[PDB]
């Protein structure tokens, strides 16, 4: 069940999944419909689901990683697609081999230096590139 803010924007949560506390390398996943493109893993908050809980759940489903939840980076709108995403830092401590989206839709994952993550997100996901700006 998709959930919405009072202005009709879909509610989402995502994590910047860093390899370590140095926050130098981040895990991106393939687009579901366009597997040659990269995205920041994330998805819809469920009814009454805390944003931090949604963020960690979606990263597990889409990227097959777990770790230590860190700070809220910010809340980011996509005006054209009408969604609003809570973005958290996650420091990855567990990388699991056969995760929900790998099994179900063959979703890929890959580590990027922050500057390269910004580069591959810019064209189709400029708001997700902006998650890294600060
Ligand atoms: O363009 P489309 O139809 O292929 O889907 C878009 C997006 O549609 P929008 O742009 O219309 O909002 C989906 O949101 P919806 O509006 O359908 O709910 C979104 O799901 P999401 O919010 O993350 O929600 P969860 O499924 O994770 O909960 C999905 O992410 P994937 O999870 O990766 O499939 C995106 O694909 P892309 O970014 O390419 O991978
Ligand atoms: Cl790192
Ligand atoms: Cl976006
Ligand atoms: F999802
Ligand atoms: Mg999802
Ligand atoms: Mg998603
Ligand atoms: Mg979901």
What does this protein look like?
- By secondary structure, the protein is of the alpha+beta class.
- It has one domain (1-134).
- The chain is 24% helix and 39% strand.
- The protein is built from 4 helices and 7 strands; from the N terminus they run E-E-E-E-H-E-E-H-E-H-H.
- The longest helix has 13 residues, at 51-63.
- The chain is globular.
- Fluoride ion (F) is lined by residues 43, 58, 61.
- Residues 42-43, 58, 62 line the site of one magnesium ion (MG).
- It is found in: Cytoplasm; Nucleus.
- Its EC number is 3.6.1.52, 3.6.1.61, 3.6.1.10, 3.6.1.62.
Compute the separation of the termini in Å.
32 Å
Task: Trace the largest sheet across and list its strands.
Answer: 4-1-6-5
| Proportion in β-strands | 35-45%
Q: Judging from the principal axes of the Cα atoms, what is the shape?
A: globular
Q: SSE order, as H and E?
A: EEEEHEEHEHH
Count of discrete alpha- or pi-helical segments spanning 4 or more residues? 4
What does the main sheet amount to? 4 strands, mixed
Cα gyration radius (Å): 14 Å
> Residue share in helices?
10-25%
Tell me the number of strands.
7
Q: Say which molecules are bound, naming each kind only once.
A: ligand I7P, chloride ion, fluoride ion, magnesium ion
Count of structural domains: 1
Query: Structural class of the secondary structure composition?
Result: alpha+beta
Motif (Nudix box): 43-64
Domain Nudix hydrolase: 9-134
Active site: 61
GO molecular function, one term: bis(5'-adenosyl)-pentaphosphatase activity
């Amino acid at each position: 069940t998709r959930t919405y803010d009072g202005d009709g924007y879909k509610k989402r949560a995502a994590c910047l999944c860093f390899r370590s506390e140095s926050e130098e390398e981040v895990l991106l996943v393939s687009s579901s419909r366009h597997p040659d493109r990269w995205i920041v893993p994330g998805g819809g908050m469920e009814p009454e689901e805390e944003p931090s809980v949604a963020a960690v759940r979606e990263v597990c489903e889409e990227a097959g990683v777990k770790g230590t939840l860190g700070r809220l980076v910010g809340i980011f709108e996509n005006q054209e697609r009408k969604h609003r995403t809570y973005v958290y830092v996650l420091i990855v401590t567990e990388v699991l081999e056969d995760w929900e989206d790998s099994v179900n839709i063959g979703r890929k994952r890959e580590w990027f230096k922050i500057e390269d993550a910004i580069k591959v997100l810019q064209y189709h996901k400029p708001v997700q590139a902006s998650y890294f700006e600060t």
